[PDB]
Amino acid sequence: DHRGMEVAEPEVLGVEFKNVLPVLTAEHRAMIQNALDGSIIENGNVATRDVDVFIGACSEPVYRIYNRLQGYIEAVQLQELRNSIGWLERLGHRKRITYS
Amino acid sequence: IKTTPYLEGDVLSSDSGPLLSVFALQEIMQKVRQVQADDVQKILDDIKALAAEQVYKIVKVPSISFRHIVMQSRDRVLRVDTYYEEMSQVGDVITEDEPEKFYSTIIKKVRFIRGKGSFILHDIPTRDHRGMEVAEPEVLGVEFKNVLPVLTAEHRAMIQNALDGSIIENGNVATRDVDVFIGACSEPVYRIYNRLQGYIEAVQLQELRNSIGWLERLGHRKRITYSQEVLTDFRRQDTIWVLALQLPVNPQVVWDVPRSSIANLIMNIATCLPTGEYIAPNPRISSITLTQRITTTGPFAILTGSTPTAQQLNDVRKIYLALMFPGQIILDLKIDPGERMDPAVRMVAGVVGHLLFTAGGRFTNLTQNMARQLDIALNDYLLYMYNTRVQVNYGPTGEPLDFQIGRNQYDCNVFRADFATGTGYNGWATIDVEYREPAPYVHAQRYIRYCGIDSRGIGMTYHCYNEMLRMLVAAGKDSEAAYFRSMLPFHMVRFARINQIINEDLHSVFSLPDDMFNALLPDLIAGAHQNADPVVLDVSWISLWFAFNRSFEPTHRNEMLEVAPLIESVYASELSVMKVDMRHLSLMQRRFPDVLIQARPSHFWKAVLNDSPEAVKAVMNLSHSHNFINIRDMMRWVMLPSLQPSLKLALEEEAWAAANDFEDLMLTDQVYMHRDMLPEPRLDDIERFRQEGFYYTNMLEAPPEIDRVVQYTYEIARLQANMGQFRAALRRIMDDDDWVRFGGVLRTVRVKFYDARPPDDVLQGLPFSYDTNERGGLAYATIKYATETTIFYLIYNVEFSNTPDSLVLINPTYTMTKVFINKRIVERVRVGQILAVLNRRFVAYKGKMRIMDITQSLKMGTKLAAPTV
Questions:
Q1: Where in the cell is it found (chain A) (predicted)?
Q2: Which residues of A fall within a CB distance of 8 Å from B335?
């Protein structure tokens, strides 16, 4: 936390800039620190649930798969889960199986 | 009265065990602990302690507000107000990025000033002098014991005359009631004392009359014995009444708190639910031989004659607990994936559950899944041809109980669960909830009548049980039909006792309001809970059968049943006080956006809940652990107008008004830095320097000029620290002989006294911390803009062995921190003006007068008080 606003720690974002820090001059280092200070965290609603949203760095092919996985997560929550649970209940009903 | 024996592993026992009021709390706490998985007496006595609350204290002598310090001189002394001395250490260190600590410190300071400001004088010491009555010096708010052994005869006589002049203006008046004398007292506590007094002289006889009337109306419903006496309106000439609490508590105050359903349920079950004992339909069955208990074959024959284990008694207790609370406790089945059982027990449990429980129509006691499992078990039992065979016709659909059985075609589809109409259970074709006449609690006026029976047991039946018997007879299950028929009186007695307990004992403000009670079932059908959350308890299969046979006998009533209204009023008043405190915090955030770091409703709630009665803290923590809260709920709650008037509320408002000026709270932003010289005076004449009383401190008696001072800000300081030029900039500005103001945030201030040279860390202390020696390679240099600052006073002690130039140092020594508070916390006062502090007016009672609290007298409502006319 900082000034009442949550700020992401320097390890969550996908960069490895710590090795070049010891040689950097003071005035560029201050700009780097200010850029770190700008990593504030907002809120967003997903599947009627609030989640933390922030900006980072990632490669395009990995980001594509990450976005696809996220979209699948939102897509499933609509109808598929309820139908699957209902079918499981019916199967337990027929096969004399009692589930918790 | 003792329970029927139960088996403990291999030995029979009949101990009652823990009280039902204690068992329930443990189960609820265990379920809550299971919620956040990813001591009961300690709480029960904590609620019980709320019946002996006090918010004032009768004191013999007021606390001393001033004291004097000797500086090795007899001409003048220092006058120190101990109010700020005690005030500076109330809170902890205030940081620049922890609002929770800041608000908690503010709340603790307000509570401390309220507690210090409330006191009542009973009987002051006094002494006669020359025919006049003079109060003794001990009752005064100043102490000067060490002052006397140094003053001369002239000043001693002067101060003796000053003491002897403290005459009680009405002392010579005969047969008087109270006495008044002039005294000295700090303004912040004098305001609270005056407010308490002003509340005192306001007579409230009508309030007591109304409270007694409401107590009688409550005792009407609680079946309290009627005392032969009728209360009279009298006032003794030697008594003064005080009434801290008003009895007719408003239910909106307690039911407006968000996510308070679990809290209210726990409080109600702690304060009203009585203990009991369990009895089998036939006594002393442990004495009879097993052969007389097992007579035939079938699932019921196997079930009959078996003795319950000790563990299953707990599940029976859970089932009964759910029985007393219809819509707040719900059952579910415990199924272990790696367990098994004789199917006869499942069959019997399925048969019993339909008669034992209710579901649909108005309310439910069991979840939809449990209803489905019970229906499946009943279906399996009905298609169990263990003794005889009958024809059956199956239905087109595959749903359970969709068939016709017996020579006479009986439709079993009516026994399938349906929460819309409740055909399959005790809610079938019967009405159980009704309204008769206004209740003592306006929020809850409903009546509960299980099976339609009322107290205002042979032959009474109900539709569901008759249909059960008809279907059992049609299905050819003749053997168990007689067993069920013989059980009716026991069943009806048990349910009559349950209705009696529900309608008569569990009535309180914590009972669920009618609207939310009616809204539970549609909410459960919808699936998305709103404004109410039930709690689910888990039971086993055999528990249903063992509960169907064991009754509940209320051997003892709840011990705390007599004192429910007092704790109810205390809880409501505490909630109102918390709401008012949070509103004041919101106003404080509104007034000062430029000096207060930030605002957050969640931090407000956490800070106000941090300092609270422990029982309330634990109950609210459990309630908010079960269900979560958000900012919207806090915003909705901080605006509702409902409040519960009391002495606590008035005292809190007066304390807030007195503490509006934050300088009284020992918080100051006027912290300055300037290089100053530590004085070293000449010692040409030791006695001449001694008699003038020299002393030094970092205090500023006047603010510096508007110019020559630079105004610093947290953002500017942070930027300079990140540049690394902070130290150089401050060094240059101090070499420029200019002042600097470290404003923008409140800092904790402490007071210290010294006679020798103070420790270096104090004299050379800094208002901030700046560290530049680190190998972290991150955050660069860390700056802490807000740190603790200390007030120090120095008293110079000189001995005759000191040379005139003994205090001259080779090189100058500097001091940095200065601060202005605009209040004379420490004064240099001559001996002639010591007694001028006595300016406040005090009023006290006499020994003949007796003061007592009427609240303890309205312990229970047993006395009628004349016709209302």
A1: Virion
A2: 98-100
φ, ψ for residue B692, nearest 5 deg? -90, -5
What type of residue is B270? A
Q: Give the strand pairing for B142-143 and B66-69.
A: parallel
Q: After which residues is chain B broken (C to N over 2.5 A)?
A: 38, 456
User: B696 pairs with which residues across the strands?
Assistant: B794
CA-to-CA distance for B619 and B47, rounded, in angstroms?
10
Identify the residue whose tokens are 């439910």. B364
The partner residue sitting opposite B373, judged by closest CB among A10, A34, A98, is A98
Contact predicate B344/B306, CB 8 Å: no
B146, two tokens: 């060490």
In DSSP notation, B220-236 reads HHHT----S-B------
H runs (alpha helix) in B69-225: 82-87, 99-116, 153-164, 187-200, 205-222
- Contact indicator for B504, B223 with CB cutoff of 8 Å: yes
- The residue in chain B having the minimum alpha-carbon distance to the alpha carbon of residue A48 is B528
Is B861 within 8 Å of B566 (Cβ atoms)? no
Closest CA to B239 of B208, B215, B211: B208
Quick one: closest CA in A to B775, which residue? A22
Experimental determination technique: cryo-EM
Residue B656 is inside which H or E element, if any?
helix B647-658
Cβ-Cβ contacts under 8 Å, A9 against chain B: none
Distances (CA, A) of B421 to B414, B516, B517: 11, 19, 17
Q: How far is CA B295 from the centre of its chain?
A: 58
DSSP B561-617: GGGHHHHHHHHHHHHHHHHHHHHHHHHHHHH-TTTS----HHHHHHHHHHSS-HHHH
Retrieve residue B113's tokens.
């000033």
Residue B428 in contact with residue B464, Cβ under 8 Å? Answer: yes
Does residue B99 sit at the A interface (CB-CB below 8 Å)? yes
By the 8 A CB rule, do B650 and B195 touch? Answer: yes
Helices B564-591 and B99-116 pack at an angle, to 10 degrees, of 120
Q: Which of A93, A94, A97 to mutate to test the interface with B (most CBs of B within 10 A)?
A: A93
The number of residues making up chain B comes to 869
CA neighbours within 13 Å on the CB side: how many for B34? 10
DSSP state of A24: S
Q: Residue B777, CB half-sphere, CA atoms under 13 Å: how many?
A: 9
End-to-end CA distance of chain B: 47
Between the alpha carbon of residue A97 and those of residues A84, A88, B56, B400, the distances in Å are 16, 10, 65, 15
DSSP H or E segment with residue B81: strand B76-81
| Cβ within 8 Å of B, A 4-63 | 4, 10, 18, 21-22, 26-27, 29-30, 33-34
B233-245 as b/e, with b when 16 or more CB fall inside 10 Å? eeeeeeebbbbbb
Task: Record the resolution, in angstroms.
Answer: 3.6
The structure tokens listed for B835 are 């007694």
CA B278 to chain centre: 35
Contact (Cβ atoms closer than 8 angstroms) between residue B428 and residue B422: yes
Lookup result for tokens 């403990």: B8
Please report residues of A whose CB lies closer than 8 A to that of B350: none
Q: What are phi and psi of B493, to 5 degrees?
A: -65, -45
For residues A42 and A54, give the distance between their C-alpha atoms in angstroms, rounded to a whole number. Answer: 7
**Tokens representing B817?**
């921190």
E strands along B755-825, which residues?
769-771, 782-784, 789-795, 814-819
Where does B685-788 have alpha helices with state H? Answer: 686-691, 714-723, 726-735, 760-763
Q: Tell me the C-alpha distance between B271 and B216, whole Å.
A: 19
Name the residue type at position B740.
V
Q: Tell me the two tokens of residue B48.
A: 């019980």
